[PDB]
Amino acid sequence: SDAPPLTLDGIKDRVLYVLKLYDKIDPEKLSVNSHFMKDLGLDSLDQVEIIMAMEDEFGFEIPDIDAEKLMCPQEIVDYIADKKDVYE
Amino acid sequence: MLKIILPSLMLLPLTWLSSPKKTWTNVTSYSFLISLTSLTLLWQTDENYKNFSNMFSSDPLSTPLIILTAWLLPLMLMASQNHLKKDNNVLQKLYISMLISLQILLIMTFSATELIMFYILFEATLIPTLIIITRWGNQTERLNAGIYFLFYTLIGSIPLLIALILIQNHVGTLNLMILSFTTHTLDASWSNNLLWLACMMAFLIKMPLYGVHLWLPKAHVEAPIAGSMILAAILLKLGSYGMIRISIILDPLTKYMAYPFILLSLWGMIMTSSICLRQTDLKSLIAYSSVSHMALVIASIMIQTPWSFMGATMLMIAHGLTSSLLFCLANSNYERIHSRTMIMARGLQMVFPLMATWWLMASLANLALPPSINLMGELFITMSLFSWSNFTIILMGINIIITGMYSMYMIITTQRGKLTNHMINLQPSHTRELTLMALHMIPLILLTTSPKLITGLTM
Amino acid sequence: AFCAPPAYLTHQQKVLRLYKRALRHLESWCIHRDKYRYFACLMRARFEEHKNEKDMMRATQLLREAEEEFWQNQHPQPYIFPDSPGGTSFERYECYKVPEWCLDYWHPSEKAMYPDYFSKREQWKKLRMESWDREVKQLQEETSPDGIMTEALPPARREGDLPPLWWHIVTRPRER
Amino acid sequence: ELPDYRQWKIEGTPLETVQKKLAARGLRDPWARNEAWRYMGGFAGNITFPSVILKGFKWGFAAFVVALGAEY
Amino acid sequence: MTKDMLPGSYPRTPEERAAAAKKYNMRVEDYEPYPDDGMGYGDYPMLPNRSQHERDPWYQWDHSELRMNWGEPIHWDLDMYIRNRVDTSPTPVSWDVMCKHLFGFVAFMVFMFWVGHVFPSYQPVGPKQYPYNNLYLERGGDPTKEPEPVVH
Amino acid sequence: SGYTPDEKLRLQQLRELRRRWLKDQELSPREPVLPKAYRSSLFAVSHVLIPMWFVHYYVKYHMATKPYTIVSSKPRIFPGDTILETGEVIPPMRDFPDQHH
Amino acid sequence: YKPAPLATLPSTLDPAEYDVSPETRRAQVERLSIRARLKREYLLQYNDPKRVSHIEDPALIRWTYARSANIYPNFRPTPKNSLLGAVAGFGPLIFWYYVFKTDRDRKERLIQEGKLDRKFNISY
Amino acid sequence: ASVEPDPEKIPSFPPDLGFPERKERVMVATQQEMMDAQLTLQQRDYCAHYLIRLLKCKRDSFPNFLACKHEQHDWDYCEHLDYVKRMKEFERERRLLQRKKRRAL
Amino acid sequence: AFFKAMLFMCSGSIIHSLADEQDIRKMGNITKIMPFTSSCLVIGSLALTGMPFLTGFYSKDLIIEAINTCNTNAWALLITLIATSMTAMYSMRIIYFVTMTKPRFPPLIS
Amino acid sequence: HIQPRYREFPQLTRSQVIQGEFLSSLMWFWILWRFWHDSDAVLGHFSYPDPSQWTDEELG
Ligand SMILES: CCCCCCCCCCCCCCCCCC(=O)OC[C@H](COP(=O)(O)OCCN)OC(=O)CCCCCCCCCCCCCCCCC
């Protein structure tokens, strides 16, 4: 009866919101097209850390082979959205 | 009685004397109008059974079977309207000139006072059934079953032709309502003991035991839509009807002699219903359920208690409408997918919402849903058998435990689940194959309300 | 659900998955949050230790033997999200996902209501009919003749073309 | 919408006094500033079970002594 | 459909196995039928007894709700291994120890009733003393046949 | 493990198509054409009054007219009260010597 | 962890998926390059304009034929099959016969005295 | 069991033995007045005379149903006695059982 | 019929207010966020066990009284008395992980 | 009305909290108004009579 329809900006302003809490990367100098492994200094293990917050932010636990692909935080905004059928 | 069949004779010119785009409407129209004329013989104001003519008669056992036979005709005459839609004018009339012969012959059977007139009509109803299957069947195996249906039957029916002749030579007349009076007991003699098998097995071929029943799946699966109705609704019962008749002249030596076939049914009344769980084809599935239920009639006549006959007329006729119903339900999908398998379409009720209500109300007729006539039929037969021996419920209960599974599993894996979105060819519902189901249930809704009509000789 | 799983190309995602499974089979044991936030980093270090080995035998014999231990230390009722497999809300709203071909069976008095939706739908069917052979042709002249084929997942090469198989992915009904 | 990402400090929470035992081993826990929206803001963490088993005891007991002196 | 597109009869002449697997769309080493011990299992494959639960509840199968694709030969007993009837999926507790704590818990928990029925928790009191004899009448008894001698 | 480029237009061209198809939104401007006391003091009339006229006509004039449809138990007589058919008045009960409480 | 025919052991045990070998890895490739020849033939045939009818699914037609019309052509009467095929048809059918005749005979002789004084019954 | 030889299996009155002039237990309620008040069979003790009061108040004082508490105390007290009267027959039979072994010398 | 017609009725007030989640694990501050449902759930669960007049007494008391006042059994008493203190435990578990234990559920307060 | 709050604790709308505080407050009136009156949840008031502390008077 509640939980209004999220549309792509309450995601993007909310994904990047999350990444700033991580404290091991992202010193308030990241961006939306900022890859992880090559220009932020993460491991692959440091990436599984990331997706779980997003999983813990919505509740639709990402399959095994989709966290493998999602590196840029735009790509996270880009997969959340194609599924939940945003932009009506 | 002649008033009821002689019009049915006159539907047969009408097909050939009518233009093609006006002959379905007429022979559909008046066949309902025969049912009313075929319904006056519920005027049983006294126990004095209605003996119109010296050959014909009526009976609270026959009278349901008379009335059902005239009611399946418009039902089945209409179910083959879209089947054989594109074909010749003449076949489109000849199938009707054959599917009416079943009305006439079968009414002459249950109307009969004798066994020979019943006998020649016990088998003359076979020409219009072997011809439906093999000439309009949509499968290669149409012939292997027509041979089965032809030859499982006659092997049981020709000794019946040898016992009926002998009872004449011993008595002279060989009819009902004399032999019931001139009923001299039997001396339990080997000579006098094979006569049971003679005058009992032809009727146990039709009511399929756990042996000879192989004609029952092979025939249904191949019959287009309507050589499964009449083959299950009434022809399947036409075996039972004779055993209520002919078992009167052999009552002392069926106390002990029926323990095989009281028991060859009850066991296979689980096996068939167990097969019915784990079966692929959908039209092969109503069949095995029809053996499990008519197996309870075989184990009805062989106890001879009064409720056991009541539990047979209520179970025969009730099975006759829910069975013929489910075939319409299945062939309402075979006309779309053109496959009998039950997993190919597994997620309907998104697309056929109202038909799902007819699958549901039919499954509950398939199982025992109490305020009804199937459960009344599956109960009085359960009570007779309890009185017969109190360890039958260990068997009769396992079937009930099974019978709630497949009749649900049919609902699950055809109307519940993710739709088969690779089927553009699911036209929602014709108005014509969606009144077929009404012409089955509303009878059950009404015949459930006054089942004083549907009882037999006893009540 | 959108990308195909092939035969796994490395030992990596056999581990990045075990850090995904077991890490989720700890919040169930650690129902609270601060407790869970402590025993996770101690589980972090157990992988940040033995990080890079180059001895592939002993790298697997830590991995294979993790589930000779993990299996006997996981939770029977973990926390699986709704909309995920097994847990509730998974197929809940699938009864209401009709497959969108059935909408080409209405008639006037049923679809003549709102003629605007169908003012679009007709030219979608033209986008689909005027793009099929041009699609299969791109699938046929693809450089995928021999051997390996996961799906080849071909895109529309950069022209006015419309991509490979898309009536699946577009036009799939809406989740809820 | 979405308040600032500088208000969710650790200090005072139970995470404070959970970070010590990780600093005694040296891991630093990169998270716990995301999973910290529940201790410091509004949810001033103090819920003792003798506050829901007898919630409303004050007014109701105060409402009894009326009836206890309404027999007259 | 074709005659030699459907199943057959126990492919001897191992060149037939090379044809059967390409008929069933299977790798040849993966193909082995039932052991030819009579029954009607012909050239139809074995397909180790997976249920349709441990198949990916993820990747978007064609035969969704059944976890199969357009080919990939169907299991023989795919009327129990569908995802409605039977689950051969893994289990956190081993089977043999599952079927020990269950019948072990019950069988002990049964025997503890017998020990109780021998030593029931009875109240240190006598029986009920009813007003009349045992009332004898509204409990069931005719006052034309005898009365009874009992009295407190 | 990171979206190879040829696995990126297939995953973007479908979006602008989906984002467009998914924008097959119902036209809020205009869509299907479609050519207390009064709310409570008629319900009871409709359902609590008129059916009572049908049931009471059934229970008073078919059930009461048949022998054993309506059969009660006794009205639970207790000593020290009369009866409204004969004036029987039944006798009272004896001593009750004492109690202690 | 001790497996069983049910409760089968997972993929993470059971040492497949570990041996990335030149001959164990080629199987998974062609075992999957047939899965992509085939999904492809469905996806290309699923959403094809003018496919009007359903997808025939011949793998299901090979299944039903195997199970109801390729059985008796592959029947060879052995032992393990005929003793197995007589215990099933006549075994219980003979078991219950000695269960009912005993009851009918028990019940009958109890009538002949009157030791089965029949309760207020009309069902016969 | 911290052995108990055989205090009470669970009978009462195998002997009616004792002191000479033991009185007879007396009922207060006439039968036809009492059964015809539809009291049940498992529920009719010698204290069925206080319970028709318990209902002749509950029947006539039908509203303010909290009116018969002064008459349930009358009944249930009488039913506390009979539970005690039989309890004396436990201890009596006990001591008697101990007295029948006390005379084993 | 006034407890399970309440607790479902009062827990479905949660399961629909927040997301479709319905486990104790991922939700834990229903008192301060819902003073209503966390007030009537107690009236259900506290009336479920033994609270001396809340209709888990006028039913239960005469049962727990009658069961240990009758020639019934020995083992079937204990494993009901133990279970009588077990309708307290899991009812103490609903009122702890859902109603106490500072929250754990996704941020969006719908 | 429709006012989500991603984080910090929301508004109360004083009909959940007053009815919630009242339904629970109505209890301990009734529980206590019933305990002041109907304090028979402890032994009743019928004095379990000392199983064997009567010295054989009124014993046979
Ligand atoms: C659109 C059709 C509308 C049909 C009418 C609507 C009302 C239907 C009511 C149906 C309920 C009754 C059904 C059963 C009635 C049975 C009556 C019967 O047939 O018994 C025989 C009776 C004659 O009695 P009998 O003893 O033989 O001797 C009479 C001496 N004169 O025979 C009779 O003489 C009376 C027969 C009455 C049968 C009713 C069915 C009539 C339908 C057939 C006629 C169709 C006409 C078509 C249009 C013709 C062109 C104008």
| Structure-block tokens of residue F53 | 């006229």
Cα C52 to the center of its chain, rounded Å: 29
The C-alpha of D33 sits at a distance from chain I's nearest C-alpha, in angstroms, of 14
Cβ-contact B262, B302 below 8 angstroms = yes
User: CA quadruple D52, D58, D61, D64: dihedral positive or negative?
Assistant: negative
How far is the C-alpha of G77 from the C-alpha of B105, rounded, in Å? 44
If you ran DSSP here, which 8-state letter would residue B108 be given?
H
DSSP B268-289: HHHHHHHHTTS--BSHHHHHHH
Alpha-carbon distances, residue A1 vs B263, B299, C96, I110, J1 (angstroms): 60, 58, 18, 9, 12
Report resolution (Å) to 1 decimal. 3.3
SS3 H85: helix
SS3 I109: strand
Q: Is A78 on the interface with I (CB under 8 A)?
A: no
| Structure-block tokens of residue B94 | 């000849």
Residue of G nearest to B390 (CA): G103
Report the structure determination method: cryo-EM
Instruction: From I29, I6, J17, J35, select the one nearest D55 (Cα to Cα).
Output: J17
Domain spans in chain B, listed from the N-terminal domain onward: 2-459
Cβ-contact B254, B304 below 8 angstroms = yes
| Structure-block tokens of residue B382 | 């359960």
Q: Is D37 on the interface with I (CB under 8 A)?
A: yes
Q: Which of B37, B42, B44 should be mutated for ligand 1, with most atoms under 8 A from CB?
A: B37
How far is the C-alpha of H78 from the C-alpha of F100, rounded, in Å? 9
Q: Between chains, do B418 and C91 touch, taking CB under 8 Å as contact?
A: yes
DSSP bridge partners of B281: B341
- Which chains sit next to H, with 3 or more Cβ pairs under 8 A? E, F, J
Q: Between chains, do J52 and H17 touch, taking CB under 8 Å as contact?
A: no
How far is the C-alpha of D40 from the C-alpha of H44, rounded, in Å? 67
Q: Between chains, do E38 and G27 touch, taking CB under 8 Å as contact?
A: no
Nearest CA to ligand 1 atom 35: B37
Give the nearest ligand 1 atom to B3 CA: 19
- At B303, which amino acid appears? I
Q: Is C147 on the interface with E (CB under 8 A)?
A: no
Residues 7-66 of A with CB under 8 A from D: 10, 13-14, 17-18, 20-24, 49, 53
Query: What are the CB-based long-range contacts (under 8 Å, 24+) for B28-36?
Result: B28/B74, B28/B77, B28/B78, B31/B70, B31/B73, B31/B74, B31/B77, B31/B103, B32/B74, B34/B4, B34/B7, B34/B8, B34/B70, B34/B73, B34/B103, B35/B67, B35/B70, B35/B71, B35/B73, B35/B74
Of A9, A43, A66, A82, which residue is the catalytic one? A43
Taking the centre of ligand 1 as the mean of its atom positions, its distance from the CA of residue B37, in whole angstroms, is 7
Secondary structure of chain F in the HEC alphabet?
A: CCCCHHHCCCCCHHHHHHHHHCCCCCCCCCCCCCCCCCCCCCHHHHHHHHHHHHHHHHHHHHHCCCCCCCCCCCCCCCCCCCCCCCCCCCCCCCCCCCCCC
The C-alpha of A65 sits at a distance from chain D's nearest C-alpha, in angstroms, of 24
How far is the C-alpha of J18 from the C-alpha of D59, rounded, in Å? 11
Residues in chain C with CB shorter than 8 Å from the CB of A79 are: 2
Q: Between chains, do F23 and A82 touch, taking CB under 8 Å as contact?
A: no
C14 Cβ contact partners less than 8 Å away, ≥ 6 residues apart: C8, C63, G17
Residue of F nearest to H59 (CA): F76
I73, I78, I79: best mutation site toward chain E, by most E Cβ within 10 Å?
Answer: I73
| Structure-block tokens of residue B183 | 């009923």
Could you tell me the residue range of the domain that residue A39 belongs to? 1-88
Cβ-contact B33, B79 below 8 angstroms = no
Q: Between chains, do H12 and E127 touch, taking CB under 8 Å as contact?
A: yes
Nearest CA to ligand 1 atom 2: B33
Q: Which conformational region is residue C153 in: left (phi greater than 0), alpha (psi within -120 to 50 degrees), or beta?
A: left
SS3 B112: strand
Cβ-contact B70, B107 below 8 angstroms = yes
Alpha-carbon distances, residue G110 vs B254, G101, G106, G115 (angstroms): 21, 14, 6, 5
Burial class (CB in 10 A: 0-12, 13-18, 19+), E84: middle
Residue B39 CB less than 6 A away from ligand 1: yes
How far is the C-alpha of I102 from the C-alpha of I89, rounded, in Å? 20
Q: Is B306 on the interface with E (CB under 8 A)?
A: no
CA dihedral D14, D17, D20, D25 (to 10 degrees): -60
SS3 A45: helix
Q: Between chains, do D27 and C33 touch, taking CB under 8 Å as contact?
A: no
How far is the C-alpha of B64 from the C-alpha of B35, rounded, in Å? 12
Concerning whether A78 is annotated as a catalytic residue, the answer is no
Q: Which residue among J6, J9, J27 places its CB closest to the CB of D60?
A: J27
H58 Cβ contact partners less than 8 Å away, ≥ 6 residues apart: H65, H67, H68
SS3 B226: coil
| Structure-block tokens of residue C173 | 């009904």
